[PDB]
Amino acid sequence: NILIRADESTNALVLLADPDTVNALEDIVRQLDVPRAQVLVEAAIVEI
Amino acid sequence: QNVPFQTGTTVERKDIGVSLKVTPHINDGAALRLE
Numbered sequence A: 001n002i003l004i005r006a007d008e009s010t011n012a013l014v015l016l017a018d019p020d021t022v023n024a025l026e027d028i029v030r031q032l033d034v035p036r037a038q039v040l041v042e043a044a045i046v047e048i
Numbered sequence B: 001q002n003v004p005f006q007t008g009t010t011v012e013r014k015d016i017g018v019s020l021k022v023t024p025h026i027n028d029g030a031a032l033r034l035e
Helices: A019-029
Strands: A003-007 A012-016 B002-005 B012-015
Touching (some): A012 A019
Antiparallel strands (some): A003 A012
């Protein structure tokens, strides 16, 4: 059996699985939770 | 202030002045997200 349910309050995830499936879902989660990247955009306009 | 503005005369109330609306998302540690 396999049960993954959510919680949007503390943003958490409740897993219920056998420990091999627990390690596989940890491998999924550790490769889907990354800090994303930022861009500073400087647009410039010249008119003569 | 809070001012009226015409949408026709069918005027409406609307807020004017310094304003801020934050929505965070907080990791257990560093690198918070802000909206």
